[PDB]
Amino acid sequence: DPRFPHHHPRPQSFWEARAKALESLLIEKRLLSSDAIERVIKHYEHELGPMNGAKVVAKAWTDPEFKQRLLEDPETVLRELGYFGLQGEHIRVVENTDTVHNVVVCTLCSCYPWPLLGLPPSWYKEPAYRSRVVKEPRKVLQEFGLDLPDSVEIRVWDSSSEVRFMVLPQRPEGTEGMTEEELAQIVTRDSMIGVAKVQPPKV
Amino acid sequence: DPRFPHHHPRPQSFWEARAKALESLLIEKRLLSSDAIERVIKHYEHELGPMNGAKVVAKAWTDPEFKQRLLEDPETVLRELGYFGLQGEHIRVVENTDTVHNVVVCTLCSCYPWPLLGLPPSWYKEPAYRSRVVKEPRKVLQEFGLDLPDSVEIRVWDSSSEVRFMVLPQRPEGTEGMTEEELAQIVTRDSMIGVAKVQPPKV
Amino acid sequence: MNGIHDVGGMDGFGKIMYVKEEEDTYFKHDWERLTFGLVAGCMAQGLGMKAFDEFRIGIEKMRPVDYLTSSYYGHWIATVAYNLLETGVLDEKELEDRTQAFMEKPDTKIQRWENPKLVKVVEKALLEGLSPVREVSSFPRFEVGERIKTRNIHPTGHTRFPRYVRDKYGVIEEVYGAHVFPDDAAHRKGENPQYLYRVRFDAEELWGVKQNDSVYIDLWEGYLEPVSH
Amino acid sequence: MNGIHDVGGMDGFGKIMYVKEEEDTYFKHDWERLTFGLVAGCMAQGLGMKAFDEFRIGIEKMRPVDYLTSSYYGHWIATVAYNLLETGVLDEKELEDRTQAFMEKPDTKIQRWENPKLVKVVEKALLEGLSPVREVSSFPRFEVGERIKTRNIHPTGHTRFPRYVRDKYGVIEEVYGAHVFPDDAAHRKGENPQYLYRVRFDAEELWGVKQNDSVYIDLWEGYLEPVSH
Ligand SMILES: [Co+2]
Ligand SMILES: [Co+2]
Numbered sequence: 001d002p003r004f005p006h007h008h009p010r011p012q013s014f015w016e017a018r019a020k021a022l023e024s025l026l027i028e029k030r031l032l033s034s035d036a037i038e039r040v041i042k043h044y045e046h047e048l049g050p051m052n053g054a055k056v057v058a059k060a061w062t063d064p065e066f067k068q069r070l071l072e073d074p075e076t077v078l079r080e081l082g083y084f085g086l087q088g089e090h091i092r093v094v095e096n097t098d099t100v101h102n103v104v105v106c107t108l109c110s111c112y113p114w115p116l117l118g119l120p121p122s123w124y125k126e127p128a129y130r131s132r133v134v135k136e137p138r139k140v141l142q143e144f145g146l147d148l149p150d151s152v153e154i155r156v157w158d159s160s161s162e163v164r165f166m167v168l169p170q171r172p173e174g175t176e177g178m179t180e181e182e183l184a185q186i187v188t189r190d191s192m193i194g195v196a197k198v199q200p201p202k203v
Numbered sequence: 204d205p206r207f208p209h210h211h212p213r214p215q216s217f218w219e220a221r222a223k224a225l226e227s228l229l230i231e232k233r234l235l236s237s238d239a240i241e242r243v244i245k246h247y248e249h250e251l252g253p254m255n256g257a258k259v260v261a262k263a264w265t266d267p268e269f270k271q272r273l274l275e276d277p278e279t280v281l282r283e284l285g286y287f288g289l290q291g292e293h294i295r296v297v298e299n300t301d302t303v304h305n306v307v308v309c310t311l312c313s314c315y316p317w318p319l320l321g322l323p324p325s326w327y328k329e330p331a332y333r334s335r336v337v338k339e340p341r342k343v344l345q346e347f348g349l350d351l352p353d354s355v356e357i358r359v360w361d362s363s364s365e366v367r368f369m370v371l372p373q374r375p376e377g378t379e380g381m382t383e384e385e386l387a388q389i390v391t392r393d394s395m396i397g398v399a400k401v402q403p404p405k406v
Numbered sequence: 407m408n409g410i411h412d413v414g415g416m417d418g419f420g421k422i423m424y425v426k427e428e429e430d431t432y433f434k435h436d437w438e439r440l441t442f443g444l445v446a447g448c449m450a451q452g453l454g455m456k457a458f459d460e461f462r463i464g465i466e467k468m469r470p471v472d473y474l475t476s477s478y479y480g481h482w483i484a485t486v487a488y489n490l491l492e493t494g495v496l497d498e499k500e501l502e503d504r505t506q507a508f509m510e511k512p513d514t515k516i517q518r519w520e521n522p523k524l525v526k527v528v529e530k531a532l533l534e535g536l537s538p539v540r541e542v543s544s545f546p547r548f549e550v551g552e553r554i555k556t557r558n559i560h561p562t563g564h565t566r567f568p569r570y571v572r573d574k575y576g577v578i579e580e581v582y583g584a585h586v587f588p589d590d591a592a593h594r595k596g597e598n599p600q601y602l603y604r605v606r607f608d609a610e611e612l613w614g615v616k617q618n619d620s621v622y623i624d625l626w627e628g629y630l631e632p633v634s635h
Numbered sequence: 636m637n638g639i640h641d642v643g644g645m646d647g648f649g650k651i652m653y654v655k656e657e658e659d660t661y662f663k664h665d666w667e668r669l670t671f672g673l674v675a676g677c678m679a680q681g682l683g684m685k686a687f688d689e690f691r692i693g694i695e696k697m698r699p700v701d702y703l704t705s706s707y708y709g710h711w712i713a714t715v716a717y718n719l720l721e722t723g724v725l726d727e728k729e730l731e732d733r734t735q736a737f738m739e740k741p742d743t744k745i746q747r748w749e750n751p752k753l754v755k756v757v758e759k760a761l762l763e764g765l766s767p768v769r770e771v772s773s774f775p776r777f778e779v780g781e782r783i784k785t786r787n788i789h790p791t792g793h794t795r796f797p798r799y800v801r802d803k804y805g806v807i808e809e810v811y812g813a814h815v816f817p818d819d820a821a822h823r824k825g826e827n828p829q830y831l832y833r834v835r836f837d838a839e840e841l842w843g844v845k846q847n848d849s850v851y852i853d854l855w856e857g858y859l860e861p862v863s864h
Pocket of ligand 2: 312
């Protein structure tokens, strides 16, 4: 025990107590206000969400010119739409095709384009996904229920720099006739990460 | 919590309870006897120890012929001395010189020549030593109080196969006149692992 | 550093706990929501953290057992405390006493205080961001299409050079421009911009197995080296 | 597998808890002494384990958090249970109930039983050992002094090919002969002997830094490949 300190992890309560200790200290010293701490929670829990990226996908799914502009100079296009911000300053959009499939990850931590898709999924920041997706993406995808043929190239994008990536899925073969606003409703968060494909609204 | 099972480690009591559960089950099924479980504890806790290797070092420190025989065909020499057994079937003896220093380890687990030095040190099986000794042996050695010049080559031996290694330290410059049995008393366990040098009996 | 956070390519972490997005809750506890604020609040003012480089190193320095056991937002708490202590914003003994106090009586309420002034600062950061793009006079060494070779180096400090791509051959896909160099900025050694490149690697080169898979990653010029002839 | 046990080259594990040998106690608890017996007892009879290959894999399969938290002898317990279940020597539900029982009332005594017959078997193993040396008809591919190159492969199962030496150049120092191949024996696929070699590596080749240090390690022929021209 005295020679095996590393065997014992700090209890979950410790971290909770530490966060409170930090909050009081920063406030007490007039370094951080309470209304500022709330502004953030409100902004990441009720203001940002996958809904933003969904609109981008829907617009590109219905406007060939927009799509091109988006794939060539994504940073400019997104800035005009207003989907810009902390951890979303530089974004690249990768397109899925019948022969190419894209899947993003952050093996080192959990980098995700907050301004576009909101906060990341719980499994996205855990070791299981981060460790395996780069070495055997096909197996990992099966676990999500996505079985891709061997003729389909899988491209894994690891966010090692401040640059973030978003996946532009293919328009399901059941739509046609639907409007932009109606298409934005079928685009799922997982489809923009590359772990799933948008299912046809047919059924 | 329900999606974060890997965050919680099994309590130390679980392992203890498991060992007992195993003991009763094996005994109850007449697969393992109690007098057999004791024979082993007695053999590794009271029969084997660093004392064995110490005698080998002392004999080589006083018999040039033995030393040569030992360095060339160690397996045969050790078999004649009787220092043979489980996890000690194949052993190699590496010699330290004024320009060469040897240090053994088992980065993958904790392989150690039981029949020769007994059970390994507590720090020898922990991650700290195993992870660093192969990349920056000099720093690790300083922590043990051993500061080696840059002109001295350090050879790290990682026990990846069933083959085990033992370090033959240099005879301190304070002995001379001492007998074999008297020299065996100054050879330390750590000196035969390479993390320390035998200090001169002068002081 | 070759820490536990660099899990790329490791085995043993088991299956993925997949959950439907409409059921995957963001924060389960109040202290987690608090942490997000604590992080965004300090960085916006440059308290202990100018950008995310100093933030990631704080996490990487955690003890392996704490990194795997504490929750995700536990990592954020560790780095915020690390950085505030380092930069002397808060005293060691000062923080320890509070932590213990809140572990004794977790229900203890905190004096509320407010001012729209800071709130305006935090909003500025959330909407304007912190682009690491900079301007330099150096001429980039590599060009799109060129075959590259990652250097075999093992930095002790922070670095965005994951182990699974060291000492491997790849192809430059894009030249982003110059970005703040993590390895230096994270240790307060000055954001010394360096050209950033997106390099593509084949599964065969990384894992020794022919599969129709490939990995794209962004590497700083200081991690790459030209192919010898 | 690229598991948490392959710590060679990692950072973050902190300082070494050095302790004087005359003060470093072997077993602090009785269950630890028990474990040693449990391990040596089964392997001597070939119960769940013929040699140490099946034994090491059992540990490697542990959950990362359990491997870092349980004590050293906790690893031994995990593998013994793993192997006994796998080989069907003991039933899953059968072991779970006992474990729980002993967690409820740890003071529960066990019926003592003995027989010098098994004791004689255990002694045989402890004194004769389990040499993995075998005889084969194959001609070794490499010779002492030859410059070699470790293969870039990432086996999913057991292997004694640590990550810090993959895809690196080295020099054969010795040809031991043929030894049981871990990668197969550990998974009960047959001990398919292979020539074992001791390869020497320079610090520069492994860590990209010129230092007067070198690493010696034993690698099976299946991990090595000839240098292209
Ligand atoms: Co990240
Ligand atoms: Co070992």
